[PDB]
Every structure is written in structure tokens, then in C-alpha cells.
């Protein structure tokens, strides 16, 4: 088969899903990992695309690289870009998405920790997770380069991790491009 770079890892949290893994103070979701190509569309090709999950699934796929240490959060030390698009509108940026990270196509690819896609009432939001939020460099060039990718026009935030721990009041993101 043809090999990918690095391995990447699938979990999906189905809100409506039946029979929810139930851990001790956790919900357990199914989780895959794939490191061919022939692998991730073996997943991609069994799983909806965004436009047919519910309202309040959430699909991530991270490089298993960076998996921390026992619950504790992923790439906490950086934040994410996200784009916000209208129900049924995300498909394809979350395709995109994904075959630019397991493609290692970014240019500073070292700092892509993952991608989630999340499906809520009136919007879908799909993010780039990465990981320094320091590397001011890194995380410009990340942004502007999904955005061209996606040939996205508008304007994209980056929010740092951290930053969550953060009232309400904004502004929000470190960065916009």
C-alpha cells in the first residue's frame, strides 16, 4: 500500500449514538487509526460526511505523534484555527482538511496536531489544532496557507488553549488572517 508519513488517528463523538461507552467519569469513543492511504479512505468512505451527522457530533482526526499523556488535553500549549460555516456547508473544507494534514502539505506540518469538525444547531465549525502557540511564524503561515488551500475569502481566528481559561468578555483570538 502507500504509506502516509505519519499515523493519524479517527474517534467520533456520536451525541445521539447508541450504546455510549461509559467510563469512569468519561465517554469512551470509537477510535481508529490509519497509516496508509488505503487506510484513511477505508474510514473516510464508512463514515457520514458532516452534512449527515447530528447536531452535537463532533469527528476528529489527530496525529498520534502527539497523543498525551492520559486524559490530559491535546497540544495544550497551542490552540486552533477555525472556520464557521452554515449547516450542510463543510464537507469539503473538512476533506480538504484532512488530505492537507495526512498529506503533510503545510509548511510548518510540524506544528498540525489535528483536525476536528463539529456539527452544533446553526453552524459547523471545522478546526486546525496545532500545537506552540508561541511560533507566531508558524501559526501565521499555518492559517493563511488552509486558507488558501480552501480558497476561504474570509476572515479566520486562531484561539489559543490556554486563553479558555478566560472570562467571556472578548476579543478572542491571538491571530486572524
Known amino acids: 500500500a502507500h504509506p502516509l508519513e505519519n499515523a493519524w488517528t479517527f474517534w467520533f463523538d456520536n451525541p445521539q449514538g447508541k450504546s455510549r461507552q461509559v467510563a469512569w467519569g468519561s465517554t469512551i469513543h470509537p477510535i481508529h487509526t ?4 488505503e487506510d484513511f479512505w477505508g ?8 452534512s449527515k451527522l447530528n447536531v452535537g457530533a463532533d469527528f476528529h482526526c489527530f496525529k498520534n505523534k502527539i497523543e498525551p499523556k492520559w486524559e490530559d488535553p491535546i497540544c495544550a500549549n497551542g490552540g486552533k484555527w477555525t472556520i464557521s460555516c452554515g449547516r450542510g456547508k463543510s464537507d469539503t473544507f473538512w476533506l480538504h482538511t484532512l488530505l492537507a494534514m495526512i498529506g503533510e502539505q503545510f509548511d510548518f506540518g510540524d506544528e498540525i496536531c489535528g483536525a476536528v469538525v463539529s ?3 446553526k ?3 471545522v478546526a486546525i489544532w496545532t500545537k506552540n502557540a508561541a511560533n507566531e ?15 476561504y475569502k474570509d476572515s479566520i481566528g486562531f484561539i ?14 491571538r491571530y486572524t488572517v
Open 160 to 173: 489559543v488553549h490556554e486563553d479558555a481559561k478566560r472570562s467571556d468578555k472578548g476579543p478572542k483570538n
Open 34 to 37: 490509519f497509516s496508509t492511504v
Open 123 to 125: 453552524q459547523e465549525r
Open 119 to 121: 456539527v452544533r444547531q
Open 43 to 50: 474510514l473516510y468512505n464508512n463514515i457520514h460526511n458532516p
Open 137 to 151: 511564524a508558524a501559526q501565521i503561515s499555518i492559517g493563511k496557507q488552509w486558507k488558501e488551500f480552501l480558497d
